[PDB]
Amino acid sequence: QLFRAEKGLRLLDDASVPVLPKFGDDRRHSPEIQAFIEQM
Amino acid sequence: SFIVGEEVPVITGSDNPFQTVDRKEVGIKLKVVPQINEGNSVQLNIEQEVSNVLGANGAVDVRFAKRQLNTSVMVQDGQMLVLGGLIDERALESESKVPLLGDIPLLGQLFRSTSSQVEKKNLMVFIKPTIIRDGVTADGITQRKYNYIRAE
Amino acid sequence: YTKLASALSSIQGAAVSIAMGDWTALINAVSNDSSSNILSSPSITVMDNGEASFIVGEEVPVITGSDNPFQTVDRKEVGIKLKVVPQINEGNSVQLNIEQEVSNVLGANGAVDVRFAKRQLNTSVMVQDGQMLVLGGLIDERALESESKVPLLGDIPLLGQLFRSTSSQVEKKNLMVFIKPTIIRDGVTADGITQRKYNYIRAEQLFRAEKGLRLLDDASVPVLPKFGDDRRHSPEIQAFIEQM
């Protein structure tokens, strides 16, 4: 999945590719939502 | 038992001389049996469902979109517990091109056809009990809901 | 134009005709590429020694003994399905009886009725309190080659491509299923898990409310209240009730 995310979507965002979290880490927000919640 | 929805006939053994039609329920449905301990905890047996009617695309009869949770849990007096949910992600890519002409650094777009798709879905269900033991608590809850509706 | 329309209906890629005097050369060439990536995560909360069922999907009628005087129709379930019975030992291990399924509807190509694409795992395992175990999976690889040529003319070092037809195909598939239990014994653990999931959903909703509706009010987006706060009126109704 990480290799597929390196060569992202042809005509879309490269961060929309589903990638599993690190082993035993659980889900995290996308960078845009993370920045939005950090600003708030 | 709680239902807000529709009653729909379906075929169970289908002009026609005898169709064997049965009427089913779709909508928002909640069946619950509570059991309060001697203190401040409630054990719940729950059947929860959200379902609607979709037209048949190649089936003999209409289809139902269905989301159902059947379980039994323990919750505190006025706290919330998560019953279940679903996280779905999907990415699709497709390309058709002329073998050698479609890789030219600039003029190759004239010999290509590309499609990309991304879909995300998030579903979650929560439940919350509240114990009413006296008339004042019930009066407070009823007054809250009544005043909300009346203010609208 | 009927025959020409039928001839060009199935063509994908380049099919180019060159006339050179009572002789036509048709060149066909195409390259295809496809990728797919799917992640799914169903979850359910149960009590010890209790059964739990989870379905997100569809209810489809099928023929079981098919105008028609009597069809003998039965309605079946397709979708993402999870049936689980847990058993906690006295400590920190859970024995699980699991039926897991992902299934959808495919149209019949030569069958009497519709078909179901189906992936199902039925088993029983032991997992630790908060660890992950692999239940099953599939690795599939496939390569296909095909060639048709004129016997001796198709082996000329350079001019032989004019007397050949070649097809090649490669397909790869990877499927995997994992499961993970978590024991809730007190109210604080359940509160933490519920708060995590609730705050995730609410953060997504608040972000969507920042970039409101394209041509409507930005406050009409549904946003969950704060954890343990219950419903409140919209600002217009709040101002109206404050004035009154």
Place this chain on the structure above:
Amino acid sequence: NSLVLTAPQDIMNAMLEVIGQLDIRRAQVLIEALIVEMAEGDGINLGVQWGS
């Protein structure tokens, strides 16, 4: 909604105690469910075709 009981004194007293213990008020529960659904989707198509 009445019970008619006939029995000697001791059985009568025991039965009355049992009835008094089982004839009590039950509490009530208000149960609220919350269903949240969110969906997002994005797609792009781009191509060039040549014909004669």
Place this chain on the structure above:
Amino acid sequence: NSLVLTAPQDIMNAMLEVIGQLDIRRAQVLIEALIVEMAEGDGINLGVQWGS
């Protein structure tokens, strides 16, 4: 949700001990499944035909 029990003292005490041992709280389990699917495909076709 009540039990009505009638018995002599010794059987009564034994039954009360058994009830007290069986009337306890059960823990809960949150169960999460994870389904991963990946597919890839590639093909090429090339040919020349002659006609008259």
Place this chain on the structure above:
Amino acid sequence: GNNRVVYLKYAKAEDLVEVLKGVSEVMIAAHADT
């Protein structure tokens, strides 16, 4: 101690009732919820 209640870790009580009926012969009962 004429009566005991045993909490099982790995087995199922309904399974063990049939096995222990012969050995006991004495009453054996299973509570499935616990």
Place this chain on the structure above:
Amino acid sequence: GNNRVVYLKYAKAEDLVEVLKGVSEVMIAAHADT
């Protein structure tokens, strides 16, 4: 030692119950899960 529990390596207990019923005649039971 009036009771024993024997863990089988290669055979199936349900199979051996029928065979040993005659030889024992005494109670023989099989636990399939273990």
